[PDB]
Amino acid sequence: GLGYGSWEIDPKDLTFLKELGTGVVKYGKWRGQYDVAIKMIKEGSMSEDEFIEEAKVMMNLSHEKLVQLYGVCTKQRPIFIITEYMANGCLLNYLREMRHRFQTQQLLEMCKDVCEAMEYLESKQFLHRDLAARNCLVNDQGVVKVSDFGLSRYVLDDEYTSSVGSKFPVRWSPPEVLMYSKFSSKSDIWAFGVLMWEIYSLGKMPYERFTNSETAEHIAQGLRLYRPHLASEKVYTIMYSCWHEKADERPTFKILLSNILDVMDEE
Ligand SMILES: CC(C)(/C=C(\C#N)C(=O)N1CCC[C@@H](n2nc(-c3ccc(Oc4ccccc4)cc3F)c3c(N)ncnc32)C1)N1CCN(C2COC2)CC1
Numbered sequence: 573g574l575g576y577g578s579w580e581i582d583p584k585d586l587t588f589l590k591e592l593g594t595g596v597v598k599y600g601k602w603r604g605q606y607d608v609a610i611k612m613i614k615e616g617s618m619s620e621d622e623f624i625e626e627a628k629v630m631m632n633l634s635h636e637k638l639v640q641l642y643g644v645c646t647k648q649r650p651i652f653i654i655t656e657y658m659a660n661g662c663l664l665n666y667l668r669e670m671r672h673r674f675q676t677q678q679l680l681e682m683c684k685d686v687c688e689a690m691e692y693l694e695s696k697q698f699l700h701r702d703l704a705a706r707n708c709l710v711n712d713q714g715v716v717k718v719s720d721f722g723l724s725r726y727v728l729d730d731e732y733t734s735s736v737g738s739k740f741p742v743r744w745s746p747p748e749v750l751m752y753s754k755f756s757s758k759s760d761i762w763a764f765g766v767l768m769w770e771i772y773s774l775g776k777m778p779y780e781r782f783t784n785s786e787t788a789e790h791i792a793q794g795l796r797l798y799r800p801h802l803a804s805e806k807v808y809t810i811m812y813s814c815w816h817e818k819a820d821e822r823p824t825f826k827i828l829l830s831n832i833l834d835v836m837d838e839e
Pocket of ligand 1: 592593594597657661719720
């Protein structure tokens with residue numbers, strides 16, 4: 573209504589129902605009826621004007637395997653990001669809960685969910701820039717969706733923002749990122765291969781016995797993760813294809829999707 577742009581949600585339309593943890597995220601309703609998650613952005617943590625402009629672009633991204641951004645509440649502090657509600661939370665935690673007793677068919681479907689979202693982002697020339705299990709969410713039906721897409725661009729804490737930083741995603745980064753800060757579609761591809769490894773490893777940390785420094789050296793020497801016990805040879809071939817030293821030899825998300833579908837048919 574009056575005073576709200578298409579990207580702006582009126583926070584008075586929100587009903588807060590549950591604390592989901594930590595900025596802080598809550599579960600609630602929008603206009604009484606619709607489930608939403610509300611993420612409250614810690615003051616000083618984000619380049620807010622830049623994020624708000626990008627939120628307009630992100631509003632136009634729509635795919636069933638991508639967490640939907642509904643809008644932002646910006647007339648205020650902290651600002652809110654309003655999204656689709658994902659009842660089963662973070663993929664990384666979901667994987668680590670051994671009660672689920674996942675079949676490998678379920679693990680491959682999680683990979684396909686993510687790959688479909690990434691094929692969609694690739695088709696829109698939109699890089700994720702921090703793809704990892706910790707940045708995927710799981711709904712009440714067990715469907716995995718990609719979250720936080722592109723958001724690293726607006727983080728102000730310099731520990732997060734380059735390889736010099738102590739909170740940079742070294743373990744999800746190809747050699748050309750670690751060496752040269754060369755981001756591309758192919759750095760998302762590399763990260764996707766690591767995500768498949770996380771899925772088939774039930775949420776182990778990649779290179780779990782190494783520091784970030786040691787990981788960077790391992791990768792730069794041409795060495796890699798190796799096959800999770802739950803990955804078949806064909807699944808391992810797919811994740812490993814994401815880790816070619818030469819970025820241009822790595823597949824596209826379309827090719828990965830075709831490979832995943834082929835393995836689902838065969839296994
Ligand atoms: C504390 C606890 C119980 C929780 C978790 C673990 N893990 C856990 O799932 N979290 C963290 C808190 C928050 C949660 N979260 N975040 C979101 C969200 C993400 C992104 C987002 O902005 C976007 C921006 C751009 C584009 C797209 C989205 C908005 C969100 F609202 C969300 C959403 N949309 N729906 C549902 N949940 C949601 C995930 N954990 C921590 C881990 N613990 C383990 C360690 O011992 C057990 C168990 C309990």
